[PDB]
Design a protein around this nucleic acid. Structure first.
Ligand SMILES: [K+]
Ligand SMILES: [K+]
Ligand SMILES: [Mg+2]
Ligand SMILES: [Mg+2]
Ligand SMILES: [Mg+2]
Ligand SMILES: [Mg+2]
Ligand SMILES: [Mg+2]
Ligand SMILES: [Mg+2]
Ligand SMILES: [Mg+2]
Ligand SMILES: [Mg+2]
Ligand SMILES: [Mg+2]
Ligand SMILES: [Mg+2]
Ligand SMILES: [Mg+2]
Ligand SMILES: [Mg+2]
Ligand SMILES: [Mg+2]
Ligand SMILES: [Mg+2]
Ligand SMILES: [Mg+2]
Ligand SMILES: [Zn+2]
Lengths: 122, 52, 119, 207, 115
RNA sequence: UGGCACCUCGAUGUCGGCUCAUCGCAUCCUGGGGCUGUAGUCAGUCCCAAGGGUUGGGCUGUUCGCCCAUUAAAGCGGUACGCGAGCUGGGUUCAGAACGUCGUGAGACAGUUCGGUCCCUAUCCGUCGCGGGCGCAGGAAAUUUGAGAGGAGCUGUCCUUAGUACGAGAGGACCGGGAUGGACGCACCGCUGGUGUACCAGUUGUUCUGCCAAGGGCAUCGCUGGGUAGCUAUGUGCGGACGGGAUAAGUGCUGAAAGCAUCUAAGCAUGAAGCCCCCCUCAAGAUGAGAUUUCCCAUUCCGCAAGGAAGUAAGAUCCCUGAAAGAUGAUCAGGUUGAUAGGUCUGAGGUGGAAGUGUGGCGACACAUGGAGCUGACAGAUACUAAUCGAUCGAGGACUUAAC
C-alpha cells in the first residue's frame, strides 16, 4: 500500500536510490498504489553520476511491496521492502538493469521489459 | 442548559405515569402457605420444590 | 461470554478463587445470584480435577484453590478435601455438581441473593 | 421467479475447476412446502406462501395447525411469500427443494443483517472524527445539526441509534453447488445475517 | 467446527501432501499457468506459519531471493501446488516464526532435527 | 463597496480552519441540442438540463493567491459572510516586554515583535433510535396489499469497430459491441491482517505455599512471542444493470388560417445523466385504522331493558434458562414428551512438547516416555444442575338498510 510520502527503494540502475511518492496516478481521489501501479515521485537519494539525478520528478512502477498481492488461486506474495522502477510513458524502464525479484503481476500490466530484465519473476 | 419555562402540574403528572412500581411476582409456597417470589426459595419455611 | 462482576481481571480471579475454596469448605454459601452463576462453572471444573485424581490434576487444582483449612480436627486443607471427599462423593455423577437456589433481594442494595451448594 | 427459504449455516471456500478459490456461504434448506396459493381473484395479487423448518407440536398453536392442515404437513417455523411466481406450476402441499436451482445460476439473497445495538454516527453512518490532538475536544461526535435559519433540524440529520437488524438484499450472487442429498446451497460470497438466521434465495430480479 | 461444512469440503481436501510443521524447509512445486501453457515453478523456503483448519488451512513459506526476502502463502489443499518435498526438518520452539522476518544471514538459520 | 440607523448595548461571541450538511442555477464534469470563420481530432458561442460528482500537497493565521502533482471535473453563490450551549483558538483588540517612529511627558501608531484562563448536568420544540396505552363494533395466531416516505443516481482508461469515415499530410472519428479500474455504498469474516485483560507458552525482580521440584501474588495484562469466539478494514462478495411511460431544448410529418410557404391553430411523431416507474428499504395510527388463511364459540350471574359483573375458550403474559437480540423495555431460542444455558464427554481451532520418571552431562541443560499437556466465547452429544408449584390477563360479538 503505497501512498503519498511513502519512500521506495529503486530496483534498477537509473541513478536514483530512493524516491518519495508524490502522487498515486489513476483516479481522482485514489489513496493507495499496489504492485503494478504507476506513481509520480521525486528522487531523494541518487547515485553520483547516474542518468537520473536527485530532485527530479519521475514516474515509477511499483514492483515490490510489503503488503504484497493476493492471487485468484487463493495464494499471496509478500516482500520485505517496497521497491519501484523508474519508467518512461511507454513503460520501458529508464535504467538498464533490474535488481531483486519482481512480482508476476507486472506481466498483467504489460511491463514486459521489466519482467524480462528481472533476475526473478515470482 | 436550564429550563426555559417551569413545568406545569399537568406536564409533571403526565411524565410520572410510567414512573411506577409493579406488583411482585408472588406465588404461594405450597409447603407453609406463605407468599414467596416465584422461582425463589421460601424465606419463611425454607422450602423449595417441595423440600426444606 | 462471561461476566465481569464489576471487578478488574485480577480482582475477579481472586474473588472466584476465594469463593471456590469457601464453597469447598462449607459445601454451601449464600452470595449474589450473579456471583453464584459464575461460581458454578469454576467450581465444577475444579471438581473434575478432583475426580481425575492424578498428580498432574492435583497441581492444576493447587494453583487455583486457596490454602485454607477445611477441617481443623484432621488438619485437612481445602485441596485435600476436594480430592478426598468431594471427588469420592461425585465419582458416578457426570457433571452438574452444584445447584443455585434464589433467595429474595438483599436489604441495603436490593441485591438478588442466592444459595449455591454442592448437590 | 424461483425462490426458497433456508438457514444460514456459515462460510467456507471451494476450489473451482480452473483452480480459483471461491468463498461460499452454506445455506441449508430442508424442502419447503407450499402452504397457500394467493390469487388475484380472492386476494388481489398472485403469490406462493412457502413454509420452512418444521416446528415442534408443543411450540405450534391451534391457529397454525389449522392453516397448514390443507397442505398436510407439520407446522412450519418460517412462512414467507414469493411474488412473481408461475402460479400454475405450484400446488398447495407441494415441496419446493433446492434442486430448483443449478450451479452457476444468478440469485438474490435476502436476510436480516446482524444487530449491532446502539451505535454512534461514526460507526453507524461512517462519518469522520474530529482531530484527536492539537487541543481538539471533538472526537466521535455527529457534527453540526445544521444552519441557524430554519430554527430547527432538518429531517434526515443522521444521528446515533440502533444499528443493524434490517432486511437487506444482496443481488447477483452465483450458485456454486447444489447438494440435493443434504439440501445445501453453496452461494459465492457472503449474505446478510447471523448463522442459523433465515435466508431467502430468489432468482435474480435483474435478470 | 460444524460437522456439515467438514462433509461438504471433504472431497476437495488433498491427501498426498506430506506432514510438515513451522520450521521445516519445503520445495513447493507451484503450477504456474500463463494461459494455454503451464510451467512448474519451484519455491523453496522455510515454513514460517501454518494456520486454519480443514479446507481453509493455509501455510506461508519464506525465502531470501537476490537479497530480498519473499514470502508466499498458499492454501494447503490448493490444486495449484503439484508437489511438496520436505527438504529439511527444522528445530523450532513456536508455531509462528515471525522473528525470522527481522533476521538475515547467520541469525536466520534454523537448527536441523533429523526426523 | 456603499447610503440609511428600523431590531438588538439588564450582551444577537470574531476571521480562518474542523465535523455535518442543505438550497438556488447565472452548469465546472457527465447527458441532450442549435449556429460556426464546425474537414477530422479539438474547439468557440447559445439553448435544455441541478440526477450524481466536483483532488492531495508546498508557502502563509490566513480567506485569497502563486506554485507542485493529479482529475471527467477541480463550478459560482445563499443558509446570522450556514454551523464555537458541536470543536479548535493560529490572526485580531485586555493586562507583560521590546524595536522603528512620534511626543517635553504620561503615552501613542502613520508600523512591527515574543507571551497570554474558550463557562453551562438539555425543561420545551426540532432531530436519531426504543418502548408503554388505546383505537381500528367479538376474542386471537400468522401471512400480506401499498396510499405514502426514504435510499440509490458518479465516472475514467483500454480493446474492438478502424488506422476505417475525414484529411495533402499531420493526425484521426460518430454510432455500436466488449473488458477493466477510481471514488462511493451495502453486507460478511471463508481468505489476508488488527484486536482479543478468565487461551497457550517463554522470562525478570521480590514475597508466599515449611524446604527440593512444581506453582500462587505483585510489578501497565510486569514484560515478551503467538492466538479461539466476537467485533473489525486496510480483507472479501455484491451494487449503481437492462430497460418502459411522459417530457425539456431540438428535430419533424401532415396542414390551413394567408391558392404559396410554415413543427401548429385541429391532428400525428421523435427526442435528455433530468420527471414517473423499473432496483433497495420502511410503510394500515393510510382514524380512509385495508385484504387473505386459520383458530375459539354464544357460558354463569344479575337488571324491565339499555347495560353491568364473574368464571373461562382460542391465545397471551407474569416468572424462569439464555443470545443469533439488547442502554432498559423490546426482539428471538427455550421452560421437563425440554437440548435453553452451565457442567460432563467427544471434537475443532490455538499454543507448542506439560508434570512425574528415566537416560546423557561436573553443570547450566538435552533427549525419551509423547503433536504431549493445557485450553474463554466455537461444534456435536448427553437431563448431571437450573428452566418448580403456580398466578394474571383474555371473547359471547350495537343499530339501520340492502341482498340472500
Ligand atoms: K524622542
Ligand atoms: K477475519
Ligand atoms: Mg496485575
Ligand atoms: Mg481528549
Ligand atoms: Mg419555523
Ligand atoms: Mg493449526
Ligand atoms: Mg430618524
Ligand atoms: Mg435579557
Ligand atoms: Mg443571552
Ligand atoms: Mg439554465
Ligand atoms: Mg459565520
Ligand atoms: Mg450555535
Ligand atoms: Mg490566538
Ligand atoms: Mg418551545
Ligand atoms: Mg472465525
Ligand atoms: Mg524452587
Ligand atoms: Mg505491594
Ligand atoms: Zn414456605
Amino acid at each position: 500500500m503505497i501512498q503519498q510520502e511513502t519512500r521506495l527503494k529503486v530496483a534498477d540502475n537509473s541513478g536514483a536510490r530512493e524516491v518519495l511518492t508524490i502522487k498515486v496516478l489513476g483516479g481522482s481521489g485514489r489513496k493507495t498504489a499496489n504492485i503494478g501501479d504507476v506513481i509520480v515521485c521525486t528522487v531523494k537519494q541518487a547515485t553520483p553520476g547516474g542518468v537520473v539525478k536527485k530532485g527530479e520528478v519521475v514516474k515509477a512502477v511499483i514492483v515490490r511491496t510489503k503488503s504484497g498481492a493476493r492471487r485468484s488461486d487463493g495464494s499471496y506474495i509478500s516482500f520485505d521492502e517496497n521497491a519501484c522502477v523508474i519508467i518512461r510513458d511507454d513503460k520501458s524502464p529508464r535504467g538498464t538493469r533490474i535488481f531483486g525479484p519482481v512480482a508476476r503481476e507486472l506481466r498483467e500490466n504489460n511491463f514486459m521489459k521489466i519482467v524480462s530484465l528481472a533476475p526473478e519473476v515470482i | 442548559a436550564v429550563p426555559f419555562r417551569r413545568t406545569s402540574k399537568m406536564k409533571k403528572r403526565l411524565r410520572r405515569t410510567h414512573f411506577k412500581l409493579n406488583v411482585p411476582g408472588m406465588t404461594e409456597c405450597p409447603s407453609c402457605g406463605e407468599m414467596k417470589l416465584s422461582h425463589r426459595v421460601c424465606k419463611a419455611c425454607g422450602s423449595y420444590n417441595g423440600k426444606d | 461470554s462471561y461476566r465481569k462482576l464489576g471487578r478488574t481481571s485480577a480482582q475477579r480471579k481472586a474473588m472466584l478463587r476465594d469463593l471456590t475454596t469457601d464453597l469447598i469448605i462449607n459445601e454451601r454459601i449464600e452470595t449474589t445470584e450473579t456471583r453464584a452463576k459464575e461460581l458454578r462453572s469454576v467450581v465444577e471444573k475444579m471438581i473434575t480435577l478432583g475426580k481425575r485424581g492424578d498428580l498432574h490434576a492435583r497441581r492444576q487444582a493447587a494453583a487455583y484453590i486457596r490454602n485454607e483449612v477445611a477441617n481443623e480436627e484432621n488438619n485437612q486443607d481445602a485441596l485435600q478435601k476436594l480430592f478426598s471427599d468431594i471427588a469420592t462423593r461425585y465419582e458416578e455423577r457426570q457433571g452438574g455438581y452444584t445447584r443455585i437456589m434464589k433467595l429474595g433481594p438483599r436489604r441495603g442494595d436490593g441485591a438478588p441473593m442466592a444459595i449455591i451448594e454442592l448437590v | 421467479t424461483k425462490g426458497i427459504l433456508g438457514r444460514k449455516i456459515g462460510m467456507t471456500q471451494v476450489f473451482a475447476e480452473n483452480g480459483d478459490l471461491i468463498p461460499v456461504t452454506v445455506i441449508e434448506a430442508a424442502p419447503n412446502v407450499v402452504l397457500q396459493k394467493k390469487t388475484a381473484e380472492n386476494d388481489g395479487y398472485e403469490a406462493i406462501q412457502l413454509g420452512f423448518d418444521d416446528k415442534r407440536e408443543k411450540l405450534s398453536n391451534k391457529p397454525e395447525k389449522g392453516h397448514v392442515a390443507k397442505a398436510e404437513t407439520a407446522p412450519k417455523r418460517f412462512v414467507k411469500e414469493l411474488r412473481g411466481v408461475e402460479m400454475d406450476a405450484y400446488e398447495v402441499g407441494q415441496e419446493v427443494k433446492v434442486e430448483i436451482f443449478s450451479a452457476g445460476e444468478i440469485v438474490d439473497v435476502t436476510g436480516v443483517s446482524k444487530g449491532k445495538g446502539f451505535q454512534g454516527a461514526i460507526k453507524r453512518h461512517g462519518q469522520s472524527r474530529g482531530p484527536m490532538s492539537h487541543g481538539s475536544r471533538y472526537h466521535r461526535r455527529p457534527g453540526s445539526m445544521g444552519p441557524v435559519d430554519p430554527n430547527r433540524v432538518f429531517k434526515g440529520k443522521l444521528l446515533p441509534g440502533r444499528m443493524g437488524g434490517e432486511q437487506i438484499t444482496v443481488q447477483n450472487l452465483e450458485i456454486v453447488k447444489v447438494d440435493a442429498e443434504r439440501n445445501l446451497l453453496l452461494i459465492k460470497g457472503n449474505v446478510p445475517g447471523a448463522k442459523k438466521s433465515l435466508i431467502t434465495v430468489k432468482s435474480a430480479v435483474k435478470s | 467446527m460444524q460437522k456439515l461444512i467438514e462433509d461438504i469440503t471433504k472431497e476437495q481436501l488433498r491427501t498426498d501432501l506430506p506432514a510438515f510443521r513451522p520450521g521445516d524447509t519445503l520445495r513447493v512445486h507451484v503450477k504456474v499457468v500463463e494461459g494455454n501453457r503451464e510451467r512448474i515453478q519451484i519455491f523453496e523456503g522455510v515454513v514460517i506459519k501454518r494456520r486454519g483448519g480443514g479446507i481453509s488451512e493455509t501455510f506461508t513459506v519464506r525465502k531470501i531471493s537476490y537479497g530480498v526476502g519473499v514470502e508466499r502463502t498458499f492454501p494447503v489443499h490448493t490444486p495449484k501446488i503439484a508437489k511438496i518435498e520436505v527438504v529439511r526438518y527444522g528445530k523450532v520452539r513456536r508455531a509462528k516464526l515471525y522473528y525470522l522476518r527481522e533476521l538475515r544471514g547467520k541469525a536466520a538459520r534454523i537448527k536441523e532435527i533429523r526426523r
